[PDB]
Structure 1
């Protein structure tokens, strides 16, 4: 049974906050994950998002495939597009109009979400606003728990590049049941919601077990431990989201937090879930907190752009980045800055 915490609406740095932050860190260090309670509005917005997802996935494939953009990676991903994995996905990135200064300047990955309809748009936006409020609480508590200035992480996540995978896993249709293989998240923080079907498994930290640093070119965590215990089944539970660290938190904490390996098993019926990714600003760089004079950085926008180009080399978004040399804007943004 996972540990469950109730986050305060505001985090100020009081004693209850520091104690809670330490408890969250301890729960990640023991279990790799914990649950946070949702109130009735957070829960309602979660359920309405799931419902919009189910309705959209019932639309014809020709329509679903049209919900794509050559400016942003937001939009529909057919099954097998992300060993290929089985879910269909609608990716929600920051929803920027063509009038936004970054979109006008052609920054890679910046553009308007190709929403299937307004009802879906409103459900996802209000859900992601609540998820973001929780992500900020969590990052202030984590900072306090490490005896860091309260805004250590949230200073990096102002206008952060938050995004969400709106997932539908098919039922099992053969002996194969690997929905998503074992891997770690490449970003900062993951907040996850699911329906009552069941399928998410996570790996807690294991004493004496070597973990790769998945942000490095020569170390990949993908596929590791897939067929070896321990894997904790994240039991569907009403009134909670789950929370686990990604690669960037492992990097910034020097391994005091480990990026939680996770995988999804196909069930005997379809399964809906939403994986929310709370991130630094596209222009922000993560850095090691506990190792001064370390020069390593993770420029988040470069990190995100490279990952999606590699995952989707043939998507129209990737093609336009190549045709228009949009990666050049990433280099230009760093010029004349202190790094």
Structure 2
């Protein structure tokens, strides 16, 4: 067994299905079968595991070392990693996070135009950049494949999902959780606001998920060599909950935990519409502008951040009513 389950936590140990993703998804009968089997795993368990190739496993090991190095920095070398235009940077709460949003230079056209959330990432040095960025380029390649497989298994119109993620606002949440000695939680029960979540953890362990109802909590054990995938609120909105939005909570174990939360997202300028085929005939009139969706939550979950104060003081929430921030 193992019992790597954090202490004082009642849950069922989960037996997950690992899958091996192609490097190049083409629409072959094998890809369609793999997609439909993965769709079945998300509808029965709410989460599934994907095997890492040796290249993917090495980028993950390089990125896992860089994270321990950042959190090993002094409490003020870390606090100085904040930008006035980007939500990227360090947060300390009882986890600690370093979020990597789209790293855009000061002279980039969308940064010059004061678009909300757009700006350069506050790296301590190029030694955290090369590692985590190369992991995000590999995780991005997996995100596009995972979406193509959902398209083939839900028999969706080709490029129904990959058309929104061209210039996707993919972001990574580099997580470190403390030991148990809130006052007893890492993160409470919550669902992800995005499309897909590719997650990774070390051997300590502490993730719990809630599977989709048939017609209690499940502990996700740390299997080496694999990463987990579960969908978010945007996927549930597009699919009329045919693919779920998995609720999940993180508990503190007897050691410190190091984890990664990758969000494969639509473009900041994407207008996500529901899939009519999966709404029995009547799709809602509601559409979600991802840029507004993202800005509203981050100017909300991080309300006293100087990134949020500058948006209200430069009225950047107005560029969101402009059509150029709504056309990809």
Q: Is the aligned partner of 1:197 residue 2:191?
A: no
Q: Partner residue of 1:115?
A: 123
Q: Is the aligned partner of 1:47 residue 2:37?
A: no
Query: Partners in 1 of 2:309 and 2:105 — Cα distance?
Result: 20
1:230-249 matches, cutoff 5 A? 231-249=217-235
| Residue 327 of structure 1, CA deviation | 0.7
Change (3 A) 1:336 1:32: closer
Q: Partner residue of 1:38?
A: 52
Query: Partners in 2 of 1:99 and 1:42 — Cα distance?
Result: 32
Runs of 4 or more, structure 1, over 2 Å off, are 290-294, 333-338
Change (3 A) 1:51 1:74: same
Query: Partners in 1 of 2:51 and 2:184 — Cα distance?
Result: 30
| Residue 313 of structure 1, CA deviation | 1.1
Q: Partner residue of 2:288?
A: 298
| Residue 203 of structure 1, CA deviation | 0.8
Q: Partner residue of 1:207?
A: 214
Query: Partners in 2 of 1:124 and 1:22 — Cα distance?
Result: 31
Q: Partner residue of 1:260?
A: 246
Q: Partner residue of 2:184?
A: 177
Q: Alignment length, in residue pairs?
A: 310
Query: Partners in 2 of 1:337 and 1:68 — Cα distance?
Result: 29
Query: Partners in 2 of 1:298 and 1:24 — Cα distance?
Result: 26
Query: Partners in 2 of 1:108 and 1:336 — Cα distance?
Result: 13
Residue pair 1:177, 1:267 contacting (<8 A) in 2 also: no
| Residue 98 of structure 1, CA deviation | 1.0
Q: Partner residue of 1:186?
A: 193
1:288-327 matches, cutoff 5 A? 288-290=274-276, 291=279, 292-327=282-317
- In structure 1, list runs of 5 or more residues that go unmatched: 80-85, 209-228
| Residue 48 of structure 1, CA deviation | 1.4
Q: Partner residue of 2:150?
A: 142
Query: Partners in 2 of 1:118 and 1:57 — Cα distance?
Result: 16
Query: Partners in 2 of 1:302 and 1:22 — Cα distance?
Result: 32
Bigger shift: 248-257 or 145-154? 145-154
Q: Is the aligned partner of 1:8 residue 2:22?
A: yes
Match of 1:156 among 158, 164, 170: 164
Deviations 1:132-158 (A, max 9, x none): 000000000001101112311000000
- In structure 2, list runs of 5 or more residues that go unmatched: 1-14
Query: Partners in 1 of 2:308 and 2:174 — Cα distance?
Result: 21
| Residue 283 of structure 1, CA deviation | 0.6
Query: Partners in 2 of 1:336 and 1:197 — Cα distance?
Result: 42
SS in 1 for 2:285: coil
Query: Partners in 1 of 2:17 and 2:47 — Cα distance?
Result: 8
Q: Partner residue of 1:131?
A: 139
Q: Partner residue of 1:67?
A: 81
SS in 1 for 2:230: strand
